[PDB]
């Protein structure tokens, strides 16, 4: 009445299955060098890996576990340029951690600096209206310098403030400079925030520094399934429930092999 034997492989017959490999699922939105194959993908079954990382320049995703659940059942992501134009900033930051052929940065973000070292960063305002019929995933970043002088050298002296405004959201953010444990040879940090922009709605970024502006916006293609595993993928076997151990193949109404398996599955016992 309850299946106890599973398949030690991920049965990908009949469904579009993408093994993200060395890239974490959230990396597809920002675009580190390891998500260049999956900046725009479509899939029915997304498979994360333990080695995959959402990040190249050390940092974190704010509200990441909620966003990962959104991305796991997205059917993929489509991109579109938000058409931002700048005058009076460097607009081409780079870091040794995000390396393609030398120093680079996130493929979908743009690190904004002052023109020269310790020069001023002018107050700017950029807007983007979601023209499509689907909600637009929109991601921005806040760079925490390692010292007060680094933030002064990069974006100029004075207090920095980033404010994000939509029809259903409005909050301001501030960088906190300080020396943090060395991750990838760096103590600075870049934190990524996100929000959903409705159709015919306009996001608005007002800032004067320490702002990792987005270049493109993401859109969800459809529906999919998202698991993390270390098992191999099987193309000839067909399954409807999956977990970290593999594939659950059963007609019994119950099972007692995993408690959080996704997909059409028997109830946990």
């Amino acid at each position, epitope marked *: 009445t309850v299946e106890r034997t599973n398949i030690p492989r991920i049965c990908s017959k009949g469904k579009r299955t993408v093994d993200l490999g060395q890239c974490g699922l959230l990396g597809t939105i920002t675009g580190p060098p390891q998500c260049d194959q999956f900046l725009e993908f479509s899939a029915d079954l997304i498979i994360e890996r333990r080695e995959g990382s959402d990040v190249c320049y050390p940092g974190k995703f704010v*509200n990441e576990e909620a966003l990962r659940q959104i991305l796991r059942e997205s059917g993929g992501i489509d991109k579109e340029a938000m058409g931002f134009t700048y005058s009076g900033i460097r607009t081409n930051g780079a870091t040794s951690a995000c390396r393609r052929s030398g120093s680079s940065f996130y493929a979908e973000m743009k690190w904004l600096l002052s023109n020269t070292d310790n020069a001023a960063f002018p107050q700017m305002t950029k807007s983007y209206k979601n023209t499509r019929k689907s909600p637009a995933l929109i991601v921005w970043g806040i760079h925490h310098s390692v010292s007060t002088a680094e933030q002064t050298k990069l974006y100029g002296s004075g*207090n920095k403030l980033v404010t994000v405004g939509s029809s259903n959201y409005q909050q301001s953010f501030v960088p906190s400079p300080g020396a943090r444990p060395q991750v990838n040879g760096l103590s600075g940090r870049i934190d990524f925030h996100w929000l959903m922009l409705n159709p015919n709605d306009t996001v608005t970024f007002s800032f004067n520094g320490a702002f990792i502006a987005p270049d493109r916006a993401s859109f969800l293609r459809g529906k999919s399934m998202g698991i993390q595993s270390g098992v191999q993928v099987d193309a000839n076997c067909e399954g409807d429930c999956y977990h970290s151990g593999g594939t659950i193949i059963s007609n019994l109404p119950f099972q007692n092999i995993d408690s959080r398996a996704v997909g059409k599955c028997p109830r946990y016992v």
Partner: antibody, heavy 124, light 108 residues
Framework: QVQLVESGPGLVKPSQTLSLTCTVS??????????WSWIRQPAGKGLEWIGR???????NYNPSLKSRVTISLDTSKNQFSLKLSSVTAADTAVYYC????????????????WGKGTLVTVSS | DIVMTQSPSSLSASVGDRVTITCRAS??????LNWYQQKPGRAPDLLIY???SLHSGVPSRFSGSGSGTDFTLTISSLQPEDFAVYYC?????????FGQGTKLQIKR
């Protein structure tokens, strides 16, 4: 130890501009992690967030009061002020200073310093 | 604006009881909720920020549980000096909104 003190007239006449002032002790008003805010409380009712301001001068006003609300700061005096225009009988309430701490690394903000509060009746 | 419906408008509990106050959101804002204790004639003092983390200086008998849209403030072993009105605050997006408040009265 940051401390806030309200200073302003105790009553204003109808259809006039109510003006208050917050004197911040124990810390600079150019702190990189402080949104200086105003919150009012009608006697016997609940709290109503009015607006906040940053050291840069950027402000956010409550949309209901945005038409009549102006918030400014005085970096030389270590103070910030609130001016409520076209005051009606409903604006009779207790008005509080407040400092919203942005120090949290996970971006969870909170009012951790409040002024004592100053009642402002409005009447002829 | 985010409406904050806060339940138990007024209540009576004896010294030592385990009082629970609930606050419910119109959205789901990943626990951007703060709790304040306002005694008579005073400004509200911050008890709990980020739903579950205690503010430094408040006693250990104040707890905060909650996920998504439903959050609860809990006072284990209620003491007579806990008589006050408690408010929940949404810290997700301005204009910030508060609950209607909960007057906690002591039964002796």
């Amino acid at each position: 130890q940051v401390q806030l003190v309200e200073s302003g007239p105790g009553l204003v006449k109808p259809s006039q501009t109510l003006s208050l002032t917050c004197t911040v002790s124990g810390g600079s008003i150019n702190s990189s992690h402080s949104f200086w805010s105003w919150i009012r409380q009608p006697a016997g009712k609940g709290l109503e967030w009015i607006g906040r301001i940053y050291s840069t001068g950027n402000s956010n006003y409550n949309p209901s009061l945005k038409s009549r609300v102006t918030i400014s700061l005085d970096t030389s005096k270590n103070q910030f002020s609130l001016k409520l225009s076209s005051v009606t009988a409903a604006d009779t309430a207790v008005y509080y200073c407040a400092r919203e701490s942005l120090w949290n690394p996970d971006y969870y903000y909170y009012m951790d310093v409040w002024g004592k509060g100053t009642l402002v009746t409005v009447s002829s | 604006d985010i409406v904050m419906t806060q339940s138990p408008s007024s209540l009576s509990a004896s010294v030592g009881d385990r009082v629970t106050i609930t606050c419910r959101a119109s959205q789901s804002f990943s626990s951007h909720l703060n709790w304040y204790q306002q005694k008579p004639g005073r400004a509200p003092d911050l008890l709990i920020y980020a739903a579950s983390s205690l503010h430094s200086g408040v006693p250990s008998r104040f707890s905060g549980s909650g996920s998504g849209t439903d959050f609860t403030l809990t006072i284990s072993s209620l003491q007579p000096e806990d008589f006050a009105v408690y408010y929940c605050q949404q810290s997700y997006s301005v204009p910030y909104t508060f609950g209607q408040g909960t007057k906690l009265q002591i039964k002796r």
